Design a binder for this molecule. Structure first.
Ligand SMILES: [Mg+2]
Ligand SMILES: [Mg+2]
Lengths: 81, 87, 129, 206, 184, 150
RNA sequence: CAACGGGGCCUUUCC
C-alpha cells in the first residue's frame, strides 16, 4: 500500500464494505413488484419490510417481517425494481 | 542551502527515498539503493546503465518496499501488469 | 464527541504522513479545512486534494508528497495581536526561514507572512511545516 | 522496456503450471501481496504466474545489474532450496549459503565469515529471517521467494511462488538462473530452452 | 401563438423560436394538452468551441414541470427545426446576496435563493433528462477548482453528444469549471 | 453514543444520494399526501405512518416525493398531536416502569431505569420548551403522566 | 519589465 486510489475503489471492495463505510453511503435495500394471486394491481413491497404487507383487495399476507429481509409468504412471484 | 552571493555552504546534500521522499540519513543502515539494468536489442544487460531507486529503512522495516518497488518500476516501465492503483 | 473537525483532519493527515501514505481521506471536510488545505497546497506541503460531495457534510481526499513535517491546530483559537504573531511563530516553528503559522483573519484564512504584509490579525488557527 | 521476447512464453508458463507455483497458501495470506488471483475453493489461493514471471524478470535484471557475480549471494536454509542455491551459485558466479547462516556473516568483519555482497536472494524470509536481519543491518538489497503468507519485512523484491513445494522452489531458481544468464549474454538467443534440464535444482533425499 | 406566449417584450432573438413553437403545436393536436399552457421567457445563445451555439431557453419557473414533461419530445424537434444549435431549458432563479454586516435587513433570504443552491439547480436543469449519480470538486495544485459531475448510464444518450455544450454554457453562466463523466 | 449506556452502535438508515423520486414511482404527490392524512385520521404516528407507507406502497420517502416531512404534513392538515411523539413514547415507557415499580417495590434495576428514563424525558422536554414546541410552563409530573399519555 | 499589497465597475448583486 502507501499508494492506492481512495477515489476509485474497486466495485468488489465497495460491495464488501458496510453500507455506511463506502465512499458515498447508500442503501443496500430495494423494492419488489409482487404478483398477487388476485389481480388489478402489482404490489410494491420493501425488501426489508417491517409490516406484513397484505393485498389491496384480498386477505393473503405477501411478506412476513424478519430481522433483516422479509420473507415472501412462500407463494409469490417478484420482480426487482 | 546557500549563503549570500549564491555559494553552496551545506555539505552532504542528502538522498531521498523514491517511495516516501524522506531523507536517507547517514546512519540509516536499513535503506537500500536498487539498480535495475537497462535492456535494448534483445537483452545484453548494458553494464553501467541503470535505473536507480532509493528505498528507506522505514519503508523496508514496514515491509512496503516490495509494493513501492512494483509501483515505481511500473511507472518507469520495466513491468507491465504488477501494480494496480485501485485496491 | 466531535469538537474540531479541522483538528481531526489535520491529525489524520499527520498520521498518514508519519506512516508514509501518499493519500488520505478526511471527513467531514468543512470550509475551514478546505481553506487550510488550500494554504498548505499553495505553499506546497500537500499536492492535489479533491472534495467528495455526498449530500452529507462531505469528504476530502488529499495527495501527500512527503514534504509535510507536521500540521496541527491550535485549540482554542487564541486571539493573536500583531506583536503576538512573532511570539507564536517563535514558539511553534522549527526555523525562522520556513514553516507557517496559519491565522483566520477578517481578510480570510492566511499564513503569518500574508498577515504581516497585509497588516491584519485575528485568531490563530493552526500551523504547518 | 522489455520486448515480447522477454515477455512470458507458453513453454515456461506450462512449466510453472506443472511445478504448481500458482498453488498459494491457504486463507492465511499476508495482506501485503496483491499477487493473489481469484481464490480457488478448499481455501488454496491461485498465484498469478504472470506476475511471478514479471517479478522474476525484474529480479534477474537486478542480479545482472550487479557488476561482480561473486558479490551476489544466494541464501537457503531449507533443504528444498539448498540444492537450488548451490546450483544457482554454480551456474552464476554467485556465492552460496546452504544450511546454517552462521549469524554474524554480514557484520563481524573477521575470518571464516564476513562476505560483503551487494545483494542477497533468500528462498524463504520466515526461515531466513537471520540473513534478512543482517542485510537490514548492513544495507544489503534483498530478493526473496515469498509465498502469500511469507513476511515482507526488509524484503525488496518479492517473487511469488509456492514454498511448500520443492518443485516450485527448484523451478523458480532454475528460471532465475536462466534469465540472469540470458541478460549476461551466456545464452545468445532467448528462444532456446537452455537445454540443461531443470532437475539439477530439485532436492533428492534418497 | 407568439401573442399568447410573449411573457416578455418581443425580441428577434426569440421571435423565430417562438414562431416555430407554434408549428408543431398546430400539426400535433395530441400535444395540445401538455404544451398549450406552458410559456417561456428570454433566450440567449452561448458560443461553444466546436463552432456551435447553445440556446438556453429561460423560464420564470413557476411551471417547470410542464417543460420537464414535454422536454424529451420537443428537444429533437427543436434541433431539427434549427441545426448547429444545442437547445437546453433553464429556470430563471433569483439569487439573493448574502447580507453584509452593514446591510439592511431582508426577511431570512430563503435557502433556495442562495448562490450555491441556485447553481446546483442550474446544473440540474442543464442536465434534466439524466439524473446525477455523483459529484466531486477537484482543487488543482495551481489553485483552481473543477467540479466533476457523475451521470447515470440511463437516459444519457440524449446528452452524450452535447456534454461540451453543457460545459461551455455552465462556464459562461457561472465562470466555474465543470467536467461531465458517466461512471461505468 | 448511547446517551444512557456504554454501547457503540452505529446501525441506522442510509437514505439515498438521489434527492428525487425514483423513476419507477408513478403515484402522485397529492395521492401520497391523501394516504398520509388518511393514516393520521386513523390515528397513526408519523414514524409508523412512514413505515407503513414505505412497506405497503412504493413511497421511499414522503419527504422526497411529497416535498414535505410527515409531521410537517400532519401539522399543515391540522392533525398535529398535543405533545411530540418521542416525548409521548418516553412518557409512556416511564409510566409503565413506575407502575411496575409501585408493584412489588423491590426492582432496584427498575428504579435505576426509571431514573434514566426520566432524565431522558426532562432533556427532551427542555429541548422542546427551548424550541417552543411545548409551553414555557410545561412540566413533566409523575403524578399526571398516566393521565397525559391516556 | 517582476513580485507585493489598495480601490472601483459590470457578471441575477451596487457606495
Ligand atoms: Mg452522559
Ligand atoms: Mg460512534
Amino acid at each position: 500500500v502507501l499508494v492506492q486510489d481512495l477515489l476509485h475503489p474497486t466495485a468488489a471492495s465497495e460491495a464488501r464494505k458496510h453500507k455506511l463505510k463506502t465512499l458515498v453511503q447508500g442503501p443496500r435495500s430495494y423494492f419488489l413488484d409482487v404478483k398477487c394471486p388476485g389481480c388489478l394491481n402489482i404490489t410494491t413491497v420493501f425488501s426489508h419490510a417491517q409490516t406484513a404487507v397484505t393485498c389491496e383487495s384480498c386477505s393473503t399476507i405477501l411478506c412476513t417481517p424478519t430481522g433483516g429481509k422479509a420473507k415472501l409468504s412462500e407463494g409469490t412471484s417478484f420482480r426487482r425494481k | 542551502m546557500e549563503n549570500d552571493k549564491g555559494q553552496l555552504v551545506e555539505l552532504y546534500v542528502p538522498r531521498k527515498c523514491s517511495a516516501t521522499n524522506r531523507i536517507i540519513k547517514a546512519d540509516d543502515h536499513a535503506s537500500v539503493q536498487i539498480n535495475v539494468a537497462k535492456v535494448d536489442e534483445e537483452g545484453r544487460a548494458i553494464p553501467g546503465e541503470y535505473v536507480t531507486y532509493a528505498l528507506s529503512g522505514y519503508v523496508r522495516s514496514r515491509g512496503e518496499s516490495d509494493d513501492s518497488l512494483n509501483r515505481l518500476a511500473q511507472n518507469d516501465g520495466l513491468l507491465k501488469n504488477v501494480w494496480s492503483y485501485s485496491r | 464527541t466531535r469538537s474540531s473537525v479541522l483538528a481531526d483532519a489535520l491529525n489524520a493527515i499527520n498520521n498518514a504522513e508519519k506512516t508514509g501514505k501518499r493519500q488520505v481521506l478526511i471527513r467531514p471536510s468543512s470550509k475551514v479545512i478546505i481553506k487550510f488545505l488550500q494554504v498548505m497546497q499553495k505553499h506546497g506541503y500537500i499536492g492535489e486534494f479533491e472534495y467528495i460531495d455526498d449530500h452529507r457534510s462531505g469528504k476530502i481526499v488529499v495527495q501527500l508528497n512527503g514534504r509535510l513535517n507536521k500540521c496541527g491546530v491550535i485549540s482554542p483559537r487564541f486571539n493573536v495581536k500583531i506583536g503576538d504573531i512573532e511570539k507564536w511563530t517563535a514558539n511553534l516553528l522549527p526555523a525562522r526561514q520556513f514553516g507557517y503559522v496559519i491565522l483566520t483573519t477578517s481578510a480570510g484564512i492566511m499564513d503569518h507572512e500574508e498577515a504581516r504584509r497585509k497588516h491584519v490579525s485575528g485568531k490563530i488557527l493552526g500551523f504547518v511545516y | 522496456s522489455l520486448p515480447a521476447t522477454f515477455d512470458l512464453t507458453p513453454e515456461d508458463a506450462q512449466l510453472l503450471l506443472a511445478a504448481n507455483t500458482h498453488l498459494g497458501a491457504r486463507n492465511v495470506q499476508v495482506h501485503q501481496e496483491p499477487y493473489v488471483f481469484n481464490a480457488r475453493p478448499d481455501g488454496v489461493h491461485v498465484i498469478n504466474v504472470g506476475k511471478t514471471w514479471e517479478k522474476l524478470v525484474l529480479a534477474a535484471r537486478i542480479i545482472a545489474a550487479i557488476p561482480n557475480p561473486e558479490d551476489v549471494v544466494a541464501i537457503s536454509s531449507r533443504t528444498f532450496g539448498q540444492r537450488a542455491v548451490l546450483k544457482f551459485a554454480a551456474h552464476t558466479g554467485a556465492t552460496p549459503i546452504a544450511g546454517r547462516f552462521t549469524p554474524g556473516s554480514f557484520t563481524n568483519y573477521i575470518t571464516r565469515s564476513f562476505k560483503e555482497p551487494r545483494l542477497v536472494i533468500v528462498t524463504d524470509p520466515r526461515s531466513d529471517a537471520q540473513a534478512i536481519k543482517e542485510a537490514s543491518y548492513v544495507n544489503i538489497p534483498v530478493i526473496a521467494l515469498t509465498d502469500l503468507d511469507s513476511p515482507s519485512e526488509f524484503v525488496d523484491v518479492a517473487i511469488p511462488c509456492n514454498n511448500r513445494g520443492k518443485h516450485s522452489i527448484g523451478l523458480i531458481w532454475y528460471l532465475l538462473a536462466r534469465e540472469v544468464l540470458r541478460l549476461r549474454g551466456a545464452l545468445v538467443d532467448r528462444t532456446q530452452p537452455w537445454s540443461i534440464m531443470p532437475d539439477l535444482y530439485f532436492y533428492r533425499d534418497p | 401563438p407568439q401573442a399568447k406566449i410573449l411573457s416578455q417584450a418581443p425580441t428577434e432573438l426569440e421571435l423565430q423560436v417562438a414562431q416555430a413553437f407554434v408549428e408543431l403545436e398546430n400539426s400535433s393536436p395530441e400535444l395540445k394538452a401538455e404544451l398549450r399552457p406552458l410559456q417561456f421567457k428570454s433566450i440567449r445563445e452561448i458560443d461553444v468551441a466546436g463552432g456551435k451555439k447553445a440556446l438556453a431557453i429561460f423560464v420564470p419557473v413557476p411551471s417547470l414541470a410542464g417543460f420537464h414533461k414535454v422536454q424529451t419530445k420537443l428537444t429533437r424537434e427543436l434541433e431539427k427545426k434549427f441545426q448547429d444549435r444545442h437547445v437546453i431549458f433553464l429556470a430563471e432563479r433569483r439569487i439573493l446576496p448574502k447580507p453584509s454586516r452593514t446591510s439592511r435587513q431582508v426577511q431570512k433570504r430563503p435557502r433556495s435563493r442562495t448562490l450555491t443552491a441556485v447553481h446546483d439547480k442550474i446544473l440540474e436543469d442543464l442536465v434534466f433528462p439524466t439524473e446525477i449519480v455523483g459529484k466531486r470538486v477537484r482543487y488543482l495544485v495551481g489553485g483552481n477548482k473543477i467540479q466533476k459531475v457523475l451521470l447515470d448510464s440511463k437516459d444519457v444518450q440524449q446528452i452524450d453528444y452535447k456534454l461540451e455544450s453543457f460545459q461551455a454554457v455552465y462556464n459562461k453562466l457561472t465562470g466555474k469549471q465543470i467536467v461531465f463523466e458517466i461512471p461505468s | 453514543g448511547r446517551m444512557h449506556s456504554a454501547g457503540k452502535g452505529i446501525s441506522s438508515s442510509a437514505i439515498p444520494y438521489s434527492r428525487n423520486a425514483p423513476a419507477w414511482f408513478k403515484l402522485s404527490s397529492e395521492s401520497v399526501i391523501e394516504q398520509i392524512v388518511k393514516y393520521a385520521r386513523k390515528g397513526l404516528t408519523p414514524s409508523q405512518i412512514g413505515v407503513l407507507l414505505r412497506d405497503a406502497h412504493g413511497v421511499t420517502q414522503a419527504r422526497v416525493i411529497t416535498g414535505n416531512k410527515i409531521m410537517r404534513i400532519l401539522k399543515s392538515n391540522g392533525l398535529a398531536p398535543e405533545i411530540p411523539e418521542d416525548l409521548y413514547y418516553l412518557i409512556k415507557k416511564a409510566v409503565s416502569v413506575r407502575k411496575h415499580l409501585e408493584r412489588n417495590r423491590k426492582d432496584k434495576d427498575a428504579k435505576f431505569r426509571l431514573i434514566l428514563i426520566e432524565s431522558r424525558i426532562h432533556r427532551l422536554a427542555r429541548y422542546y420548551r427551548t424550541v417552543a414546541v411545548l409551553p414555557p410552563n410545561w412540566k413533566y409530573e409523575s403524578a399526571t403522566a398516566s393521565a397525559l399519555v391516556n
